[PDB]
Amino acid sequence: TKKDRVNHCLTICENIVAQSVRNSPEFQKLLGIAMELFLLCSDDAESDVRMVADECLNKVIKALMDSNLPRLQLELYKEIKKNGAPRSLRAALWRFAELAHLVRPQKCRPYLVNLLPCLTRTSKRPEESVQETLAAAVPKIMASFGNFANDNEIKVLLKAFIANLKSSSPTIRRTAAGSAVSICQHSRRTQYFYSWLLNVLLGLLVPVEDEHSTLLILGVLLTLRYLVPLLQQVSPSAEQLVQVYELTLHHTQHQDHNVVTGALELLQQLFRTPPPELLQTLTAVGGIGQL
Structure with a gap:
């Protein structure tokens, strides 16, 4: 049935694309069935089945990217909503992110509301392949849906991802x-969330004397390194920035070489793109004594 499954999916692969009408009521139902079959066929034991299901997964999308994109987005999201096998979820997730920017602004608020639980729930998945897909899907989704989010909604997502900063993987x-x-x-x-994230990350480690998990230290130090370039112009203050610099200097004296190299990477990121408030502090003769 291995050849049967490949041929059957390939049969519906060419059938759906080579079809004159693209708005008939039967087409919408058939497209949904054809869509979900490819996601189901995207996680099969035989590898060649998988490179055929996914190849026709985007071949159908490219052909229908104009006539039936709203239907494709619904079908792709319905797969992400049902947390399933890692290969099928990450197959739908990495495609929904790619087509996220093609959603009209009138439909960017309902999708974000529905997709907030999905992003939080998928962050709990421990597979190292699902996390890699979500690592790329979040920037693409947020760049298209972020401006449609309430202030507390962003806090919900940030708290969900901060909880993964202490993970071993x-x-x-x-x-x-x-x-x-x-x-x-x-x-x-x-700017508000940059300051909000900065104190939250600092609060995770600013009790410097007390013991902190090495896993947590590596997670926060990496997060600051990703945040330092975006701080180059409420808002983050020079007191917060100098606290980050002091945190970096302390952790270069750690015993774990992973922590030492993690903090050293952050230190060079600070010096490559220094925030203007911190740069003035670091260059003044009395820099931190005043603060």
């Missing part, structure tokens, strides 16, 4: 850092 620990920074970058109040 670097892929989970790096996806959380990238997504958290990118969520703030594409929000309405970019």
Whole structure:
């Protein structure tokens, strides 16, 4: 049935694209069935089945990217809504992000509301392949839906991703850092959330003397490194920035070389693109003694 499954999907692959009418009521139902079959066929034991299902997954999308994009977005999201197999979810997730920017502004608010639980729920998935897909899907989705989000809604997503900063897996620990920074970058109040994220990240480590998990230290230090370039112009203050610089200097003396190299990377990111308030402090003869 291996050849049957490939041929059957390939049969519906060419059938749906080579069809004169693209708005008949039967076409909408048939497109949904054809869509979900490809996602289902995207997670099969035979590898060649998978490179055929996904190849026709976007071949149908490219052909119908103009006539029936709203229907394709609904079908792609319906797969993400049902948290399923890692290969099928990440197959729908990485395509929904690509077509996210083609949604008209009148439909960007309902999608964001429905997609907020999906982004939080998918962050809990421990697979290192799902996290990699979500690491790329969040910047694309936020860049198209971020401005339609309430101030508390951004806080919900940030708190969900911050909880993954202490994970053992670097892929989970790096996806959380990238997504958290990118969520703030594409929000309405970019400067407000930059300061809001900065104190939250600092509050996770600013009790310097007390013990902190090495996993948490690596997660926060990476998040600051992703946030430093975007701080180059309420808003983050020179007191917050100098606190980050002091946090970096302390952690270069850690025992774990991963922490040492993690903080050292942040230190060079600070010096490559220094925020103007911190740069004035670091260059003044009395720089931090005044503060």
